[PDB]
């Protein structure tokens, strides 16, 4: 093909290869049922030719079209050959080519493809996504094929809607008999209806011929899961049943032979497949683990058994269950079922009272763990079955045990609150009567029961706050060795939360307009005395609740690390009641014993409150200074730069040639003096480095604006004379927080490269290279005449959101994160930030005038300059004409961003993985930006990583819906323009994007209190300067503060509760509203031209 | 082998993979497989540590790499003298890891490294063909 | 009520709470069945009656299948009722066919349920 | 209150919730009547126990909307939860002891 | 008719709430501190026109709904509310004069 002239070879080869692929699609015929080796040979030819650069010097799409091919047929052949990622890529290429051909002259494309080629694009995409195994991608395939009963049944099995699956399996009879019976049996088993399933299987024997292998497979599965030891190429469940039978009959040779046969058969079946996706390995791994556990139990039971051996095997089981924390329930449940069957067999074949109790205790612990695991997956029948089995084996006489608390939790999870509360209150009564919580074994159960009952009563509002406070929560704290510490921490946190709720209610009422209206009405004489008495009582109650909440928060922070993020709330309270002596005393006596690292995420805010106004032993400023000094003592590498920045707020004019600000500067100076008194060398070196950065930032570079190759730093700059800083860690590096205070093996600054580069920008920030102790170079961006503190605090919020996302398993399985970069402010107008490598602005990649993606691909559309001019010319006119102009521009400007992943990742597997990462990044960033009200999301403020395809958000100055105050406001929650959606693939926002948005929105909703307290702490920082001002508005587009603060807090609370336009919405409804608002051309046409809504 | 100190679970797995770099009959690996399975049943806490370490870049984690390598080795043992004994050892090793969430979707098969560098060393599209065929 | 019920059971041998529950069941007023008391909510029979009152048929299946100490005839009657109210007609037919194995004891209620299922499913063969 | 009373309260509260728009517009028509005179003034306050009007009107309407939506002190509740909160507020001697003696909270 | 009236009323209520909101007055105050004033005037006129259009559509469809049955009588309140808050529009007045005078009079009884 390289030497082809007049496209003769091209035409001939195209015709013959198309004929081959068409012949592969039959089903006899003249040529059909081709060997898979030949199909793979032709697929390899196509795959090789797809990656070669054509002489036309075009794009990757032309390279994909060396031969005139119909890629739908190739995609179907690849799917038949189990090349699922290749099939998906070829389907995407075919759809793109068909769209381009149509423009020259899914449902519509699917029906057209069915018309000529006889292949439905939608059906092929659904089959490919089913083969791949990614769960969310199955939701982007919707249309006329979602009404068939089999599709609905598979969907119901996806969400484990077993009742719906059972109903639909029983209803539809046109389904093939084997599939219907298998689905019915599986649904019955997943609902816990073991006896019903057994009777159903017995009734299936009537008027039935020889069973197909699936039927006896399910029969043997039900037999071994129900312990029906009566009835009897061996398959997996038959092998398991036979092995359990042999173990019961003390025939170990047959046991080991059956297990060996099962291992060999499972491995052979797994290895005969294609091994394309990781999701294809999980069932085999689960079955192999079950076989291994059974073999270990058989080896244990072969000889005499002791208590220590059973304890050891249960410990091993618990360790392996901990390894399976993120696995799906479909893979963990069979292992648990085999475990409980094994334990019950050991129970029934013991004949020894001493070890019988040990086996019973192990079985009870296993069944409690199974109940908890089933509850975590929103399963309500398996926990009930486990509780029933516990009751069968654990007929109690004392009446109090650990498993009954789990029974109460199970009843609560089933939305039967009366039963749960009655059980738990009866248990509390029994525990109180039995003893005074003096038994070490019953202390944990009593404390947990009291705390859970108090929390449940608080939720149901069935009891007044006084009784909840006095009878359950304070009692739980009083009742209360890692388990004891954990219980103490939980009780302390619950008491603190309840006290904080009461205090916040009192404060809200005192600030409420009803209270001031009552006061005004009284202003128009025993009434005055009564009001004075009521007001003093209200103030006393407020102070008592605040003190209790602060004390219990401090005690909670001292008992563990699971609730560290609550420290924000504590600080908030202490920062809003600085004049209260009791809070200061609690922070000085017990608050000074909290580990210092827990205060690290608030270090920007705390240091902003330094002053020299309230002094003395109980003075707020003295306590704050002591706390900050101790924190900086323990963690110099996380705090010292902030203190220097506070002290060096006005060093720019010092190096060239208000009361609160002066007090903060003096307090920072005394803190720095203390640090230098302990560590003089490090303080001196860091001060020298900060001076070097500040001097370099102020160096003018307006005469190097055009050049991009690289400019050597002038020799007179102090930055070039710093060498071998053995105690100065690189400032733009994420340093792992050490609970201890050694910080031994840290990469320190060694040298700075003599040359710096410019990447553009209005103020021309400078890119420099820092060589550390090892052979690694770090890029740093030094910026002058710009404020970087807002970026730093927004990055802190991003890190907190990242921790929240990692905390929840649902978003942790999808690896949903926010891309972050370290920012170190140095003064009021200078700073240095980490320059991520491999990142490029999306505007640079898309709408570059020279070699943008919109010019390389699709060169006959409007240029970016043309669109900009057209949209600018119509700004001062009516909104309707804006709409026609914007629609005309969008008609002649089509997205081309989907090629980004196509050019860089030629392997279909890597291309799929990178596209999925891109879509998840877009979803997470969009939702988090909406929650934080992040705005000014234009093409130059969003970067993409060329190695991971993920998105990074920069220039975070505008947030908290302040972009809606500018002239021509921003009427979108986030950027979801046509290029952004086009990068997501053929399904757009209908597959992975919507589900990931829902999963992160649910995470935000479940942590609304923490997000409110974090944002409340950060917004009342006197140094943030987040509100929009006329100067900022003019620059962006070429007390009252208190009121806007509570307005922003209220709007954030509404967002995190789901209340939009007064209507409360579910997560799905809120996400739908957000998406349809973001993609609406009506809003996009009303935006600023600099936002570039058409891109 | 055990010079310069003992081996951790990660080191044992890396040694197994490094031996797997050499291509030979699957039966010759059988004994080594057994050793691996012993380690895999004695250092599950080290497995937890490995899984926590590999979460930053799940694509090149060692547990999914080991699973893929074992599956490929079992595939190469079909229709050979070592079948039904190599498969048993592979199943025993794979039962010591279980269905751990590897946080990846695609399988990479652990392509070669020197071959890619040698290919990148060439140009002109004809010397690359010569290298491949040679 | 609970203290009064336990004192009454201690002296007279009759509990007040369960007597009130029985009286309210006999009367048939639906709301009054919710305030009888919490003394005997744990027993599976009370929970099953509560589920049947609220038409919680899935929970009725789960509890009827789970509890075996319940007298047999009541258990199969409840299972058949719950299956019928969920539309599982074919599952009910196969379940009835499989129940025929234990035909040693046959109370009229099972035959009545068999005939009801036969005429509702239009079998025209269960004679 | 544990039997018929609680369930009937839940039923009527659910009816009020399902008709929140109709109730809201009826009350909005009622309140803006120039002859209703529903607000409280010191003369009536002294008699009972022996333009800010607009803002009071929207405050009352917002409180009524919150009541009909089940939003109590910023937390949205179910019908059962709202009825439980109302009952425990009404039967609480803690609140009853703070009432006017003319109300006769002990009766 | 009732569905169309309810949707138009929802749109009109959203526009009115935005006009009577804190964000709108904060934006106006921020602008109060030269083409931006013209842009604000254009936006305000467009918003008022959309509000009036939605109000007129809602009133018309409520009137039509009250003329076609008796299941939705209690919506007359809403209609009157609109007419009682938009006395000077001069389109709602004519719309009530022409088509609102054919409504059965008993439906106005609970508002007397
Ligand atoms: O607040 C900013 C501004 C800037 C910036 C300043 C001037 C010019 C440019 C940029 S961005 C950029 C990125 C790649 C290629 C070209 C360009 S142009 O860059 C960053 N970061 C942080 C994350 O890592 C990448 C750099 C943060
Ligand atoms: Zn054929």
From Swiss-Prot, chain A:
Impact when changing residue 78 to T: In a colorectal adenocarcinoma sample; somatic mutation
Tissue localization of expression: Found in pancreas, kidney, skeletal muscle, liver, lung, placenta, brain, heart, spleen, thymus, testis, ovary, small intestine, colon and leukocytes.
Effect in UniProt of substituting residue 693 to H: In AT; loss of protein expression
Effect of residue 386 to T: In B-cell chronic lymphocytic leukemia; uncertain significance; no effect on phosphorylation of target proteins
Subcellular location: Nucleus; Cytoplasmic vesicle; Cytoplasm, Cytoskeleton, Microtubule organizing center, Centrosome; Peroxisome matrix
UniProt PTM comment: Phosphorylated by NUAK1/ARK5. During the late stages of DNA damage response, dephosphorylated following deacetylation by SIRT7, leading to ATM deactivation.
Annotated effect of mutating residue 183 to E: In AT; uncertain significance; reduces protein abundance
Occurrences of domain FAT (ranges): 73-649
Coiled coil: none
Domain FATC: 1063-1095
Listed result of changing residue 547 to R: Found in patients with familial pancreatic cancer; uncertain significance; also found in a small cell lung cancer sample; uncertain significance
Region (Catalytic loop): 933-941
Annotated region (G-loop), positions in chain: 758-764
Effect of residue 751 to T: No effect on phosphorylation of target proteins
Induction field: By ionizing radiation.
Effect on the protein of changing residue 513 to L: In a colorectal adenocarcinoma sample; somatic mutation
Record note on what altering residue 43 to H does: In T-prolymphocytic leukemia
Effect of residue 900 to L: In AT; decreased protein abundance
Effect of residue 339 to C: In AT; uncertain significance; reduces protein abundance
Resulting phenotype, residue 49 to I: In a breast pleomorphic lobular carcinoma sample; somatic mutation
Family: Belongs to the PI3/PI4-kinase family. ATM subfamily.
Domain notes from UniProt: The FATC domain is required for interaction with KAT5.
Protein name (database record): Serine-protein kinase ATM
Source organism of this protein record: Homo sapiens (Human)
Gene label: ATM
Curated annotation (Swiss-Prot), chain B:
Residue numbers of the full-length protein present here: 1582 to 1715 of 3056
Compartments reported by the entry: Nucleus; Cytoplasmic vesicle; Cytoplasm, Cytoskeleton, Microtubule organizing center, Centrosome; Peroxisome matrix
Function of the protein: Serine/threonine protein kinase which activates checkpoint signaling upon double strand breaks (DSBs), apoptosis and genotoxic stresses such as ionizing ultraviolet A light (UVA), thereby acting as a DNA damage sensor. Recognizes the substrate consensus sequence [ST]-Q. Phosphorylates 'Ser-139' of histone variant H2AX at double strand breaks (DSBs), thereby regulating DNA damage response mechanism.
Organism of this sequence: Homo sapiens (Human)
Tissue: Found in pancreas, kidney, skeletal muscle, liver, lung, placenta, brain, heart, spleen, thymus, testis, ovary, small intestine, colon and leukocytes.
Post-translational modification: Phosphorylated by NUAK1/ARK5. During the late stages of DNA damage response, dephosphorylated following deacetylation by SIRT7, leading to ATM deactivation. Acetylated in vitro by KAT5/TIP60. Deacetylated by SIRT7 during the late stages of DNA damage response, promoting ATM dephosphorylation and subsequent deactivation.
Name of this protein: Serine-protein kinase ATM
Induction (UniProt): By ionizing radiation.
Involvement in disease: Ataxia telangiectasia: A rare recessive disorder characterized by progressive cerebellar ataxia, dilation of the blood vessels in the conjunctiva and eyeballs, immunodeficiency, growth retardation and sexual immaturity. Patients have a strong predisposition to cancer; about 30% of patients develop tumors, particularly lymphomas and leukemias. Cells from affected individuals are highly sensitive to damage by ionizing radiation and resistant to inhibition of DNA synthesis following irradiation.
Family: Belongs to the PI3/PI4-kinase family. ATM subfamily.
Domain of life from the UniProt record: Eukaryota
Curated annotation (Swiss-Prot), chain E:
Impact reported for residue 44 to P: Loss of phosphorylation of target proteins
Induction (free text): By ionizing radiation.
Highest taxon of the lineage: Eukaryota
Residue ranges that the Swiss-Prot or TrEMBL entry lists as coiled coil: none
UniProt PTM: Phosphorylated by NUAK1/ARK5. During the late stages of DNA damage response, dephosphorylated following deacetylation by SIRT7, leading to ATM deactivation.
Effect of residue 8 to L: Loss of phosphorylation of target proteins
Effect noted on mutating residue 34 to P: In T-prolymphocytic leukemia; also in a lung adenocarcinoma sample; somatic mutation
Effect of residue 78 to G: In T-prolymphocytic leukemia
Tissue-level expression: Found in pancreas, kidney, skeletal muscle, liver, lung, placenta, brain, heart, spleen, thymus, testis, ovary, small intestine, colon and leukocytes.
Subcellular location as annotated: Nucleus; Cytoplasmic vesicle; Cytoplasm, Cytoskeleton, Microtubule organizing center, Centrosome; Peroxisome matrix
Domain statement: The FATC domain is required for interaction with KAT5.
Function as written in the Swiss-Prot or TrEMBL entry: Serine/threonine protein kinase which activates checkpoint signaling upon double strand breaks (DSBs), apoptosis and genotoxic stresses such as ionizing ultraviolet A light (UVA), thereby acting as a DNA damage sensor. Recognizes the substrate consensus sequence [ST]-Q. Phosphorylates 'Ser-139' of histone variant H2AX at double strand breaks (DSBs), thereby regulating DNA damage response mechanism.
Subunit structure: Homodimer. Dimers or tetramers in inactive state. On DNA damage, autophosphorylation dissociates ATM into monomers rendering them catalytically active. Binds p53/TP53, ABL1, BRCA1 and TERF1. Interacts with NBN (via FxF/Y motif). Part of the BRCA1-associated genome surveillance complex (BASC), which contains BRCA1, MSH2, MSH6, MLH1, ATM, BLM, PMS2 and the RAD50-MRE11-NBN protein complex. This association could be a dynamic process changing throughout the cell cycle and within subnuclear domains. Interacts with RAD17; DNA damage promotes the association.
